[PDB]
Amino acid sequence: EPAAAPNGISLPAGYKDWKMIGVSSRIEQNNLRAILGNDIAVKAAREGRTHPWPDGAILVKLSWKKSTHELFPSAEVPGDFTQADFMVKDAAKYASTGGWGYARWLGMEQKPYGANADFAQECMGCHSGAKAADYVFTHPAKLP
């Protein structure tokens, strides 16, 4: 089992089996990302209950290096897995980080990120830009 994050959050088991909320590509990072969520999160996302997200909602963003497909150079496809970023909603328990518990695990080896238990202030530094949207940038992708 991977080590916990320095703020005590354990790696959510089973996140590879979760349903999709969106996808993204970060230009500046040369990364492709999938955004998944547990069933609490997915229900919320689909029903628009995101002001705030419900307690128990977990979002995960999975990041891979962009490569190009060997048979189809215009297709940018995942290569190396770089990290898994989580946000766990618990309004009471993480009230100091805006009601979310942040945690990141690096690579296939899944080393928990962060020098100490205050690493999540780094997350907050950017995520506070989405404070109006409960610190979540992702808009759930449209599906019929």
Are the C-beta atoms of 78 and 88 separated by less than 8 Å? no
Question: Nearest distance from residue 93's CB to a copy of itself, in Å?
Answer: 26
Q: Which of 135, 125, 106, 105 has the alpha carbon at shortest distance from 9? A: 105
Are the C-beta atoms of 120 and 7 separated by less than 8 Å? yes
Q: From the list 6, 40, 64, 90, which residue makes contact with a copy of itself (rule: CB under 8 A)?
A: 64
Is the Cα torsion angle 141, 90, 131, 120 positive or negative in sign? negative
Q: From the list 3, 4, 75, 95, which residue makes contact with a copy of itself (rule: CB under 8 A)?
A: 75
Check whether the bond before 52 is cis (ω within 30° of 0): yes
d(CA 6, CA 59): 18
Structure tokens at 46: 């689909």
Using the contact rule CB under 8 A, the part of the chain among 86-94, 95-103, 114-122, 123-131 near a copy of itself is 123-131
11-50 residues in contact with a copy of itself (CB under 8 A) are 16-20, 22-29, 32-34, 36
Q: Which of 138, 127, 116, 129 has the alpha carbon at shortest distance from 6? A: 116
Q: From the list 13, 51, 71, 115, which residue makes contact with a copy of itself (rule: CB under 8 A)?
A: 71
The binding site for heme c consists of 24, 26, 33, 61, 123, 126-127, 137-138
Question: Nearest distance from residue 131's CB to a copy of itself, in Å?
Answer: 10
Instruction: Give the interface with a copy of itself as residue ranges (CB under 8 A).
Output: 16-20, 22-29, 32-34, 36, 62, 64, 66, 69, 71-72, 74-81, 84, 107-110, 126, 129-130, 133, 137-139, 141-144
